[PDB]
From a paper:
The envelope glycoprotein (Env) on the surface of HIV-1 is an essential viral entry machine that mediates binding to host cell receptors and subsequent membrane fusion. Env is translated as a precursor gp160 protein, which trimerizes and is cleaved into gp120 and gp41 subunits that are primarily responsible for receptor binding and fusion, respectively. The gp120 and gp41 subunits remain as non-covalently associated heterodimers with gp41 embedded in the viral membrane via its transmembrane domain (TMD) and the C-terminal cytoplasmic domain (CTD) in the viral lumen. As the sole target for neutralizing antibodies, Env is also of singular importance for vaccine design efforts.
A total of 32,802 sub-volumes were used to reconstruct a C3-symmetric sub-tomogram-averaged structure of hVLP-Env with local resolution ranging between 5.7–12 Å and a global resolution of 9.1 Å. Classification of the sub-volumes did not yield any other distinct conformational class, indicating that the hVLP-Env were in a predominantly closed, pre-fusion state. The Env ectodomain connects to the membrane via a thin tripod stalk. In contrast, in hVLP-Env, Gln-653 forms the distal tip of the HR2 helix, making the helix length 10 amino acids shorter. The remaining residues in the C-terminal portion of HR2 helix bend and form a thin stalk connecting the ectodomain to the membrane. In the presence of membrane, we observe that the thin stalks, corresponding to Env residues 654–664, form a tripod that elevates the ectodomain ∼10 Å above the membrane. As a result, the bulk of the membrane-proximal external region (MPER) (residues 660–683), which is a desirable vaccine target of some of the most broadly neutralizing antibodies (bnAbs) of HIV-1 isolated to date (Gray et al., 2009; Rantalainen et al., 2020), is primarily embedded within the membrane in our structure. In contrast to most available structures where density near to glycosylation sites often covers only the core n-acetylglucosamine (GlcNAc) sugars, in our unliganded hVLP-Env structure, extended density for glycan moieties is observed across the protein. Thus, the tripod stalk of Env is flexible in its membrane-embedded state, allowing differential sampling of MPER and other membrane-proximal epitopes.
Numbering used by the authors:
A (entry chain O), B (entry chain B), C (entry chain Z): 521 to 662
D (entry chain N), E (entry chain A), F (entry chain Y): 33 to 136, 151 to 500
Amino acid sequence: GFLGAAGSTMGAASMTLTVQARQLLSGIVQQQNNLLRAIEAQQHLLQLTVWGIRQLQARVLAVERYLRDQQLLGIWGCSGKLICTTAVPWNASWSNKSLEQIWNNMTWMEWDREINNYTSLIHSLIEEAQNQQEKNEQELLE
Amino acid sequence: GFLGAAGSTMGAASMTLTVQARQLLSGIVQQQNNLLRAIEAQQHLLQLTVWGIRQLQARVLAVERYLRDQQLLGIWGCSGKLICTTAVPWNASWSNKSLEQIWNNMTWMEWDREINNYTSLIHSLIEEAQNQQEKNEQELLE
Amino acid sequence: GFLGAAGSTMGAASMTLTVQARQLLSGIVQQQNNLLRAIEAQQHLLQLTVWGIRQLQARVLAVERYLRDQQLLGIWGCSGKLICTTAVPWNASWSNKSLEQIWNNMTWMEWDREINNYTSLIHSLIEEAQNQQEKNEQELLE
Amino acid sequence: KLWVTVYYGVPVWKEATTTLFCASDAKAYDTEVHNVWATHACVPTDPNPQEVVLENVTENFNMWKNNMVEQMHEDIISLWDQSLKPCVKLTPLCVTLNCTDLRNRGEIKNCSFNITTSIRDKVKKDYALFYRLDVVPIDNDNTSYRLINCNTSTITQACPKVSFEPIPIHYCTPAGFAILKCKDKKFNGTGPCKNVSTVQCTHGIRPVVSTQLLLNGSLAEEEVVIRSSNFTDNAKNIIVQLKESVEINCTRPNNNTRKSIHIGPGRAFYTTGEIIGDIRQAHCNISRTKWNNTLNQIATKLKEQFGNNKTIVFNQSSGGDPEIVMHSFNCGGEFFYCNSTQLFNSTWNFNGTWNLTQSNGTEGNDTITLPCRIKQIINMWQEVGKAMYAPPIRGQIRCSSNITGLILTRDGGTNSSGSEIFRPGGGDMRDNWRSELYKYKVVKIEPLGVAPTK
Amino acid sequence: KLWVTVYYGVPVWKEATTTLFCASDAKAYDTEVHNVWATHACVPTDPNPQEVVLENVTENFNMWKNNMVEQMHEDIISLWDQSLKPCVKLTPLCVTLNCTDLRNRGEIKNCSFNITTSIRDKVKKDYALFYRLDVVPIDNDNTSYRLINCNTSTITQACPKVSFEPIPIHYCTPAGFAILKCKDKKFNGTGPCKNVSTVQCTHGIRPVVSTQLLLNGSLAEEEVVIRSSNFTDNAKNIIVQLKESVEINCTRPNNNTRKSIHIGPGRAFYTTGEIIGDIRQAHCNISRTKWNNTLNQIATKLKEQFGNNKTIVFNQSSGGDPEIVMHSFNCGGEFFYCNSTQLFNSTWNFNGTWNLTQSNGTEGNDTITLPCRIKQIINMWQEVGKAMYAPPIRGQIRCSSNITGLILTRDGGTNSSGSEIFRPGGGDMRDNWRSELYKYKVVKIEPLGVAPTK
Amino acid sequence: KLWVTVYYGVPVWKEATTTLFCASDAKAYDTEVHNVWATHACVPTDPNPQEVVLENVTENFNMWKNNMVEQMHEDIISLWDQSLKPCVKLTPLCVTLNCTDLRNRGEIKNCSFNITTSIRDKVKKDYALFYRLDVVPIDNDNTSYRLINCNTSTITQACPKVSFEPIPIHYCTPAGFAILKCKDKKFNGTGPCKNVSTVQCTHGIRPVVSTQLLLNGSLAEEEVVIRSSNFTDNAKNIIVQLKESVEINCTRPNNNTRKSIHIGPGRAFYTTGEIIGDIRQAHCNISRTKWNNTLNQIATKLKEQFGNNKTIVFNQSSGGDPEIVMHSFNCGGEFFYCNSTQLFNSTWNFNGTWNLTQSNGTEGNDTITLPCRIKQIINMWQEVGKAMYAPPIRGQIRCSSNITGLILTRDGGTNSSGSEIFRPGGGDMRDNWRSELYKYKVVKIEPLGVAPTK
Ligand SMILES: CC(=O)N[C@@H]1[C@@H](O)[C@H](O)[C@@H](CO)O[C@H]1O
Ligand SMILES: CC(=O)N[C@@H]1[C@@H](O)[C@H](O)[C@@H](CO)O[C@H]1O
Ligand SMILES: CC(=O)N[C@@H]1[C@@H](O)[C@H](O)[C@@H](CO)O[C@H]1O
Ligand SMILES: CC(=O)N[C@@H]1[C@@H](O)[C@H](O)[C@@H](CO)O[C@H]1O
Ligand SMILES: CC(=O)N[C@@H]1[C@@H](O)[C@H](O)[C@@H](CO)O[C@H]1O
Ligand SMILES: CC(=O)N[C@@H]1[C@@H](O)[C@H](O)[C@@H](CO)O[C@H]1O
Ligand SMILES: CC(=O)N[C@@H]1[C@@H](O)[C@H](O)[C@@H](CO)O[C@H]1O
Ligand SMILES: CC(=O)N[C@@H]1[C@@H](O)[C@H](O)[C@@H](CO)O[C@H]1O
Ligand SMILES: CC(=O)N[C@@H]1[C@@H](O)[C@H](O)[C@@H](CO)O[C@H]1O
């Protein structure tokens, strides 16, 4: 399940994340079978055009996007794995909606879309709310 | 408090770190409002000069510096958040100084400056002292 | 011990890893004493040839390899330190071999080599086995 | 408590507009041609790329708004330019010529002009074969013929070694961008799709340059599809997806000569030498019955706002550019131009059956036989500049091409509701490239996801 | 126990020497000029950049040692070069000319020389208007006039479409470098500062090229500031920061003609055509009272080591280059050169009041009126090479510029302690660019921090 | 339970094939020569690079398969090209010359040809000194002499300021690649090694261009080593590692003149002026006894398949290119070519002692004295194109070079088992560069490691 396994789901979509992540980041194998040094089998010219320099360039831009992803994981202290919470509550910004129904009938997309500037609104709080106002775990005895 | 909030402090300076970090790393928004594709409103030429190629180039050099920061966080096992200790004691290298006064009247800068080759002297020990000689936590019963 | 300290060992090789890692990643100091801006002492020309642009380019390629290393550490949740296990067992793929003897008389290399497509065979399982099927620690009572 | 929660590796699909990369299969790199018009040092296709079919999903596409065509044509132009760079120049081959019309309209006249040599002052004389399309008779001073391409811009060789044959090419996405492809057959350009099948590397295609038609392309099955960017807009080309394919025979019986003559310090010009034996003209024989079936299929497929299920009419292009008034393509390096005057003279308006032909009782002249043309020079993407020169193929040019698409232009210079007139339109050369891009849609993938969780 | 501890995101400020980036506001990209001498595809200024004022902080600055000026001028040169690249050349416009001095020193003589055309051999004759500064009379063979810029280097057009108007420009720092700006008004170049206000993107400026003065620049308030890199050093320019600003009228009443004449295959030269009506000379009228107040302010501000509070004397530059003996700037593409011979003839040594003027009882000739010059060619940053040609503005050139700074040079060829003589110095063109850079200081930011902690 | 476990920072060494970087010591950047044929803005050697000797380890090397030589020569060529770029051209210095053979085979004949000047039409006449190797007598029209390098390609100056002296150079590996170096003395090219000593930056070397020999190179100690890529293959060069070193005296007593004459707008040609005093020829005096000891050592070291311990024979190269039939090198910018006809005439087959010489009873003619040649132009790596011109050194050329290696070629045009004949071979110029690269092996470092652990 590169990108399927979630038509309208939040739980099933959440459980197929690793499969989607591994299927999506598999292009390095394709770059490995370049076989593309200078010729295919007998002869060849340079041919290196803006097309392929930009193939590598689009490669670089996307992998930089993944690098910015890793930097964000570092900023929030969220790089351990895909399972990582926030110390920030969902503002009543989003409209009244059932959560479980936001899950099952938002495909992650409907809740995101009409939380969308709400989802981002809840985004920036995390750095100085999960790291700035950074608490540990629960407060229990033994 | 991008960079203020600390005239001569170690505690207050330490508590305004997240604000300083978020204020400093905010240039990506500025890069987002480039509006700068090919023209301002009606006509335009290429104009792409060493000036702007080097704008992006200075961008690249600084962001590489932040990347080296992340690599160092990885080497020491120190990437969780800004709060991360060392298994290395401050050598009597630095001169006799009160710690709390080093805090309140060093602005982080005076203690750093006359620990400066001391601060770096204490730096390299961490990799093979916190990772090489890497112990867990405390040793207590229940 | 940049790379020595392990002729045929798995334990001693494992214990000299931090020394090897610190000795290997020490080229940044060499890049620091470039003294190489435009001239050595009195006069000089540009001379910047494909040789040195490619010195920096080989620098870039290797440091990108280390970056991919950090990305893999992130994918598995394995970036804390060199000590990080797998939720994947060694398939009976490798041939019958004593483990401790694989350690002491494989130099890490013999076990790797005839596990080699076995070692990689055991590699891909980790992402969806340590992160996909991701369990916590032990199950005990207090 | 709707505690906000963050998630990574989430399934997310967003509108991508990014670059795509080149992929050419192992059979590609085993073609062993230094470059047969198409191959590079680019990444080969991976042994087994994943095309996850996504079901119970929906995806809206717009092939005409898809940016894939743009990068495709740009990289095509970059590759052609970079391939022309190593080819030898023909600036001195530009010199005036004097052509004798030996074969007498046959456009086969041996031309013998001056071709210079390595030293500045040592020049000999040569003669090659030139058509009536490489040079023009001067009527101002009417002294000799001039290459049209030579009085307008520079002249250079077309890398005769680099044969212009079609090769399979694969476009891959970068890491984190997917290409969501519709799996639908009646799926039009700007439509949604449920047979989403995320594709890391788009399926291998056969970019053969053609005008008003398709050669060796993606076949649309289970129906005849007739799309257009604007049906009301008569100028809008009418893209058609035939169900089946026909057997073309753009094959020239006459042989070719090559006269590898060194011109510069290491530069040689392959002049077309004399042709052995009686020099006839290229012909073409095409099938009749399957074409009639496909025509009934389109005319039945044409009935869009047909008045009482009979308004289908076809006419030849009034005229215009040679590349837009006729079907041109490349086949063995020789730019074949098999004509298309046999399709404009037919009308399945009232009865698709009246115009249908029985295979068993095929007529005498049923097998479509029409004259087929060729060419030596060409300007890609209608770009006026330095031209090229196609060398000979030194042999009977046999071209076997197939049919899977069609382009029409509704007639605006006629009645609006009286009768629907379609005419061949070859104006837009990107309609050819977008016919197969109505399912693919570069799709972005974002792992970030917020969600109130307890 | 002083257990060493490590900290991240720490507030740290260190001496940065790095590149800065271009920023141009939304009003910039709404200027709609393909490029009015200044704009690019560069990043616009962000809607709301943060300028955190840092108080109870200290920061030492040195504008003369600040590297900002260097990258600024270099990127200016790179941008001007890259802008000149698309402009058409004037190499054949280099040909000899023959100018008739119709307007009779008026330096308005119609010149009619040969201007070539598209074909090699088809050449016609044209005439434009040229000044006495674009060509010189030959005294060796005294046959005609020659462009000075044309017997020394190449000639090319100055992109007449690209008008040389000043636009707002914003310099941003990279990610992790700040620009610490002093918020002080008597803050000199190499001084500390407590009004540190960290600035991600430096405040928008108006880089108008000028000599010995400032046009539409940062105003220094609450005092008159007179700095210099070395006051004892008489050669050191004396940078002055006036408190208020004056209303300049570098406005030419006479109109301009433009004769857009195609010269090359797509290249046109805007020759200055004839001027309608009686052709007079450019004038300039400037205010008197505010200038007297500012002069008293400087002379009071000049008293640095004044002997008994009266040593202030001014003199005209002995002579030298036109760009360093007078005030030059750009205004509407025409390089205006309003003279400055009205400021050297005044002396507020004994009484600042004796030289002061009452507005109510203003004299008859009080309104400063002096002759104002213009120019067509220019060499930026005193670089001897391929020159350019300013096209006409086809209209009465109205320039409105303001005043906020001044450059002087102490007189070394005089007594050391007898009388302080200041003369206009326009030698250093970076003193103009550094006058506003005495607060900004690129500052590095380092999160790493060690500290013995219990 | 063999629970798989993963480990990082593991000691791992794998076959690296990557780029290496330039390093030049502090003494380098203190050489103060803008570039003495070798130095750049490249990274200097670090004060104390780590060379961890790895013992109880094993490493197989193959210097002939080591890719270091390739990047080395390529970067050498890139640096030489980029250094030639700033040098002035000599295209007009190409003009015919007329040389008078004043010194009468002496190859010292003043030549006086036309050297052009700054203006197009103002040309004067000059004369310099040219050898018989820069120009040839024409026998077709026999009117004057022509530079051979000037009738075959372009001519340009050799940057006389850039003296071709040898400098120390250091090659560093990237971050994560090591260079495993054998610490063995009898360690051949394609062999294993136990004295592995991982080296981040390879030891400083002295790349002096030489043919069939070595100058100021790595000395192989504790034995004489005679390797070859194929010993049976007679064409295979026979690389030899002498134990000790000899004192060469490639020193020309006669002085040099330099005539710095401005030719272009800023371009000057250093013509060789007249030589003061009686002009004699360069000589060379070399030691006898140590050479005899080393020769006995090799002949004893040569006995590989010697028939009954006496098959060692040497002969002069039959002939061929000047760069492969004799020993050429650079010394002070003058390309010295001390001959090697004194080594082919000796035979230690039966008695190494019979051919040995006593130092105390040294003969009269024992001190090897042979003629020594020089040159002005050169083609690096046997590349036929634009040549260069060595300026004079204006002084007695004193070259002191040492000996640490040798190249031979077994004689194939002789008996297979009768007598082993070695002849000087200078064909392969990379055998010189690989002689010192038999221990270094770029080695990859991988921290990843799997291992069943309980
Ligand atoms: C918000 C939303 O979509 N709600 C629908 C609901 O109307 C429908 O009855 C139910 C059936 O499964 O599916 C839910 O997703
Ligand atoms: C080391 C140092 O700076 N010590 C000063 C101390 O002299 C002063 O009495 C006190 C007042 O608050 O402030 C401290 O910072
Ligand atoms: C698998 C292997 O290498 N086994 C050897 C074993 O044969 C030998 O007796 C022993 C002595 O220490 O060393 C072990 O490493
Ligand atoms: C209308 C439509 O969706 N048709 C597709 C067809 O193109 C595809 O080949 C097939 C594979 O199973 O799946 C069908 O659903
Ligand atoms: C009537 C006729 O000539 N038919 C031939 C057919 O037999 C052949 O198989 C085909 C190949 O494309 O070409 C057609 O022209
Ligand atoms: C001497 C000085 O520092 N003056 C500044 C002034 O320039 C600034 O505009 C103002 C803003 O509040 O703050 C004052 O302190
Ligand atoms: C005496 C005189 O002419 N004064 C005018 C003034 O009225 C005008 O507002 C100003 C515009 O800059 O220009 C001055 O020259
Ligand atoms: C044959 C051999 O290995 N010789 C090496 C020698 O080259 C090196 O200088 C020495 C350093 O201790 O170590 C010896 O083992
Ligand atoms: C016989 C003779 O001339 N011997 C000299 C020797 O004294 C000198 O030290 C050496 C320098 O390289 O050069 C030799 O030629």
